Amino acid sequence: EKTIRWCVVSDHEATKCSSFRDNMKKVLPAGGPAVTCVRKMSHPECIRDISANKVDAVTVDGALVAEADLPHHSLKPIMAEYYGSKDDPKTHYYVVAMAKKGTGFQLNQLRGKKSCHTGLGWSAGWYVPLSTLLPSGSRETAAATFFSSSCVPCADGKMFPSLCQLCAGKGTDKCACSSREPYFGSWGALKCLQDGTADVSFVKHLTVFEAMPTKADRDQYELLCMDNTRRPVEEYEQCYLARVPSHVVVARSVDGKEDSIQELLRVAQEHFGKDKSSPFQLFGSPHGEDLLFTDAAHGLLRVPRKIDISLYLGYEFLSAFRNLKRSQRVKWCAVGQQERTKCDQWSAVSGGALACATEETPEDCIAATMKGEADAMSLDGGFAYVAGHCGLVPVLAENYLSTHSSGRLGSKCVNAPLEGYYVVAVVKKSDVGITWKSLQGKKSCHTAVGTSEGWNVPMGLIYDQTGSCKFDAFFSRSCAPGSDPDSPLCALCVGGNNPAHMCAANNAEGYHGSSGALRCLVEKGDVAFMKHPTVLQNTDGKNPEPWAKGLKHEDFELLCLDGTRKPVTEAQSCHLARVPNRAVFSRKDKADFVRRILFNQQELFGRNGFEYMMFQMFESSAKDLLFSDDTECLSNLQDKTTYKTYLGPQYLTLMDNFRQCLSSELLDACTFHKY
Template sequence: MKAVLVIVLIIFTLLSSGKKFRWCTLSDLEQRKCAELSKALTAVLPVSNTNSFARISCIRAHNTYDCIDKIRVNKADAASLDAGDVYSAVKLYGLTAVAKEIYEQVISEYFNASCIPGVGVAAPQLCALCQGQKSYVRDKNHFCETSSNEPFYDSDGAFRCLKDGVADVAFLDHLTIMRATESEQQEYELLCPDGTTAELSKYSTCNLGKGPGRGIITRHNFQKITNQFLTMIQRLFGWKGKERARFELFNSSSFAGKNLLFRDATQHLQLLEEQLEIAYVLGLDYVALLKGLGHEGSSLDNSVVRWCCISNAELRKCEEWALSIKSDPLVCVQATSMANCIEMIKSSEADAVTLDATHVYIAGRCGLVPVAAECYGQVCTPAAESTEEMRKLHLKHKGLSPVYAVALAKKNARQINIHNLRGRRSCHSHLYSPGGWLLLSRYTVGTLENDTENCDIGSAYQNYFWKGCMPGADGNLCKVCIGDSEVEGTRVSSRCAANHNEHYYGNMGALRCLVGNPSGRSFGDVAFLEHSNLLWNIENLEISGWAKGYTAIDFELLCPDGTRAAVTEWAGCNLGPIPPSTVMTRPVTVTKIYDFLMKSQEFLGTKVDSEFHLFQSQKYGESDLLFKDATQYLAPATHMSYQEILGEPFYQLAESVFNCTPAVVLKEVFVLQINKDTESASSLKSSYVELLLPEARKGTEIQKEPSK
């Protein structure tokens, strides 16, 4: 009694606070039953002002996928759907199954004795025919257990029960029937719903239906509340509910319909554990059956593309892309960073993402493969004038044009050069960025030559710079990050985040960090970014209202030889070339993603009259969303390895750096065994420094700045 009271009070508090639990309905009759449920709840859970809120808001949807979408975008909270739709909701739209309907009551009253492994002690006659070992010791008791220790468990066990003469009828799936021997085909027959019988081979027309029953779905962050809500209405209005005389949850006869909100045959709702795999919710056989028979969930799984977005701005652009594309459906999935996208694609929670060169290396080491590479600059033939084959040949024989990493300072800060950056304030596009993290190490952490203990450039940067903003990092390299100060309540959570929700993220963000916040306060002495859209980003400072009065002549590049140059001189004053950003996916989805991208590019890539532009981001308040804005077209790269796209120098540098600076996403890939190797730590460090300092091999001495 006390437990019931606690559950009721939890929900009572939730609902009396003004929050409505929104149930998605699929018909006018369901809408009527839902409204009556709302009235019944109001009657049994009175408050001081019963008209101040509704405990259930009934959301009418057109069909099951409309329901799924409403729940996904927070316009509804839960719905009861058939198993196939539950599969689609979970696998394709990121929802979760919170409960499923259980129908055994009906069977226990119908049959004299049965064996239904897993039914438990609630209905002893349903276990009466089982033959598993009985024991008072839990680990030795296999009677009526859902495992192979119970001889009559699963479909094969049910058939065995019949063949052994223990039962008169067996309920099983068609997969077991397909494996029946010729003699078994002659000895047994199917019982059809119309009262006739049929040969075992006629299971497609003589069957009791497909798959498990309904399940209740909701959003991941709403699972606990939905659990509590279902528990409450079931205790009040279920078959044994205290208020069943007022409202029957599992009976639709008074509404002149059947199976409204829940199936009428439902005995009770079984709540599911959080993060439970869909195969265990619907059954392993059923999920395999869905895929094998081309069920709509499986066919959607084969066609839908789940693109990984790393910020609210990317999500807005992706959703507009989804509305504009005429080919396969696009679903936009949100992550917290490029590294998080790699994790999600590895675990099949997303399908594709565009990664910068360093993250291409990380993704490649994690088993992902290239689909298409961005092509920039004049060497890229405009998409409208080139064919797919021309682009493949261009990539094979000429390669893709890189972007260049540059170091940018204000023109009036004339004392700053590439050799005296120690102890200064730095602005980096993000952690692991090609220009602001990897290539930069060749010019700023040359002091590793004198450090035989540590070759981790992450910690080296913490000691090298006074403070700065490197989104995704920590410590003093997060001190000047500002998050998204324009959205109330998000500044703390987005501060130093490795995505556009941090205003100092990316090429545009590093420039903002250098010039300071809109009030004019400067946080950086030097910014490390890419040349590709630098001029536009400088112009955008004023266009966007971030900072006024800045033009290209107010900045200069810091060259490797210690001199400075105008921002237009990037070809001769840069920190090195960066391989192109590349779309990556799992090997099994390459063809799907490639076809989708080529169709998208054909319809949305460069057409002037299109409302949506694949390679433009300004309208969303940022730059380089989903793809670099400098992209001319996406060049096919399915015939290349990620190592070939990165090129030997960049790949070898990444190899050396990450052997000393493992990324979290690579913790299962990199297993450093320095202690087991014959090579000592210092010799490993020496080869690392050799790669970091190509100038040293040429005899060029790197100037050292005394520590401040």
């Protein structure tokens, strides 16, 4: 049944687990499942069996859960440890190198000597230390010949004897992947200094001052900094190898007793948290050290929705993790089917410089890119805040129509700055009553949630006017792709070819985008939110679609902040706000690459084509696929290298005061671990 089985590796953790079971039965007997202690040889065995349905949860170093993006290996973190207090959750711990004072060895002075590691596959002592000094070919068996003799538990000593030399166990129990090996984890590997088995022991900072001989023995051992210098252990925040995340409680991503383990740990921290009572301590292990949980933790917090082992660990960690054991194409992320077909025809003509990838919602693309499943893509101003808060940086800006006064433009666009676009709220001129002083109760149409056009702006102001994030309260009946299907926010929405697209955050919806946002107003809603004069792009014969046949721009009238209504042609005078124009985002590494590749491609398929000969990239068959149907080119960011300097102070501050109402799971998965 839903009875959670906990993975244990020693006898002391089994005695602690039995006490966790018994004690939890008393506090949480109804509205809570029991616990059972299933033993296994090691944590890596625990990860494996949780995938096999033999166990349910264990608290490990996510680096170990890095062998889980394959078949029979899929697992995701559901709870996250923290240190400090409850007001200030610290979800990280520094990886530092320890050594006696006198040997005087520096960062570079780590060449083939006597070193002790927490274990094989551990980020605390295997992955981070090895990334500090990246070898030629980056291999794990390569560090076995580089170092003369070291103590790396879990390693198979049958093939690599010099890798289990400083490990003092007992025949079959030596170099073990559990407590059976005296030198194991951050506690056992630190003993190589106390005892003097190795000159250096790569360990976490929390095990240093906890397993410290005397409160002042913080002077007998020093740290090796990245600055090839030394420094007292007392200053680990400015002399650390790398700062890795906390241990997490793992379980099967799909059907793994998630809600059961969430409820168990919620009460277990209510009654047995950080010495609230007295009897049984969840985080204060008796016999062994770090039993069931890291002795140093103060609690556990539930990780957000859309956060996998790749989001948790970070692209930084994993770029280095993919070269240890295991381009010229720019994998573009396409949102939807229509956007994926405009991308594959674009992949054909590039000869081979631009590849593709497809996700369902914009935020999923940003997640794809962060990882390395996609490389870049164009993002709206709202999603660029999320993409920015998530580690992605701008490459080029999607420059729109320039101030009309000249015949035409040329190589003049590549560096032509642009004041983005004016978001405008449009309403039918037919109704002689709809005003900004009375939008409540009226039906509205939204581009999509999270967009500058139909969300952050119109709804950022509405909130500075009411004070509640319940917008289905304000506009009775509306269509904002991405909202909750059961709420009024997805009432006027049409949909796609089949169900499930009812209110999908992609072009597979009849009222999605500015084109759809206008269609909606034409037939269902009373108000609408879109960008820079896009109404002329769909009226008076501009759009082929049936809904835009006998539509004249006189049928439509803009609405201004004050209350009055002005012509849709004059949006410079009547608008909601000026927002930063769209931008291409990617990682710090694929930054210059994509830009160089993008310049080359618009040079071939930019606005310098003819009719249908070349390929239109700044022109989509439908509406705004990959790039808005009104972009001139892609301009240099210039000084604006960050999202902060790109979006600007005004808009960025608008996203902070609106952040409360933003229910972006992505933004909160990225913002989970504070630093």
